[PDB]
């Protein structure tokens, strides 16, 4: 079982336990739920000498801590508050195992913390081990977190191979629960020469994407943060389909975002379309106001409809039989 020191620490025998006092017991404390938290907090404010004593004791088996549910946190604290020399030694222990670690439940968090704190050179050395394994990491439950972090942290030129790997896969990745998150990071951090081919594929498949459970969120992202040129193309896809997409579980979200983020003239054309459109025995507005999804589009159209059209809308809304 546990060492007596760790057991006593857990039983609150030592209210002032110090890092120097757990010498020889550091690997064990690091892998204990409470011993790890103790070390995590102490490293935040330990003197550099105190950090090095902890480090000298875990360096030899750092990899073992990296893939441990509690030990990974201690490794992360070193990337966060340690010296350049310690981060460098950890990077060296990581070399050749980036893929293995990225696909590991705890190791992926070590890679993320490392990317956030190491030099461009070691970031590049790490990201390059993912070459030829991009699509696998993007779709992996642990690996997608590493790819997302690379995109937020690494120089864009060093991310080109990741963009290249997405060629022709944007539709599949955008309709993936983990892949859709990677696509959103690309849109937020990459250079225009890199986002261009991605947006090109999103535009090509907008019709299908707006109806997908994950894909609609990627499209909403472009509507919320994109360039006008890109928002206009998406609005164009919704135009002439406001009625039908409004009643769709997922597409209704995109329609809503179009009403909210399209140009002045665009919002008008869309609102107009809903007033003059018909749906069998009634108007489009009629059917939409009472639909579990389409009602939100009608609401938002009000809050944004320029006074001129607002009147008109509600005018056909008067007949309140519902």
Swiss-Prot record:
Residues 1-322 form the PUM-HD domain. Residues 72-76, 216-220, 295-299 are annotated as: Uracil-nucleotide binding in RNA target. Residues 36-40, 108-112, 180-184 are annotated as: Adenine-nucleotide binding in RNA target. Expressed in brain, heart, kidney, muscle, intestine and stomach. Not expressed in cerebellum, corpus callosum, caudate nucleus, hippocampus, medulla oblongata and putamen. Expressed in all fetal tissues tested. Pumilio repeats lie at residues 21-56, 57-92, 93-128, 129-164, 165-200, 201-236, 237-272, 276-315. Residues 252-256 are annotated as: Guanine-nucleotide binding in RNA target. Signal peptide: none annotated. It is found in: Cytoplasm; Cytoplasm, P-body; Cytoplasmic granule. Induction: Strongly down-regulated in keratinocytes upon UVB irradiation. Sequence-specific RNA-binding protein that acts as a post-transcriptional repressor by binding the 3'-UTR of mRNA targets. Binds to an RNA consensus sequence, the Pumilio Response Element (PRE), 5'-UGUANAUA-3', that is related to the Nanos Response Element (NRE). Mediates post-transcriptional repression of transcripts via different mechanisms: acts via direct recruitment of the CCR4-POP2-NOT deadenylase leading to translational inhibition and mRNA degradation. Also mediates deadenylation-independent repression by promoting accessibility of miRNAs. The pumilio repeats mediate the association with RNA by packing together to form a right-handed superhelix that approximates a half donut. RNA-binding occurs on the concave side of the surface. PUM1 is composed of 8 pumilio repeats of 36 residues; each repeat binds a single nucleotide in its RNA target. Residues at positions 12 and 16 of the pumilio repeat bind each RNA base via hydrogen bonding or van der Waals contacts with the Watson-Crick edge, while the amino acid at position 13 makes a stacking interaction. Recruits the CCR4-POP2-NOT deadenylase leading to translational inhibition and mRNA degradation. In case of viral infection, interacts with DHX58. Interacts with TRIM71 (via NHL repeats) in an RNA-dependent manner. It is linked to Spinocerebellar ataxia 47: A form of spinocerebellar ataxia, a clinically and genetically heterogeneous group of cerebellar disorders. Patients show progressive incoordination of gait and often poor coordination of hands, speech and eye movements, due to degeneration of the cerebellum with variable involvement of the brainstem and spinal cord. SCA47 is an autosomal dominant disease with a highly variable phenotype and incomplete penetrance. Clinical features include developmental disability, ataxia, and seizures. Neurodevelopmental disorder with motor abnormalities, seizures, and facial dysmorphism: An autosomal dominant disorder characterized by global developmental delay, impaired intellectual development, early-onset seizures, poor overall growth, delayed walking, hypotonia and/or ataxia, and facial dysmorphism. Some patients have hypoplasia of the corpus callosum and cerebral atrophy. This is Pumilio homolog 1. It comes from Homo sapiens. The lineage of its organism: Eukaryota, Metazoa, Chordata, Craniata, Vertebrata. The gene is PUM1.
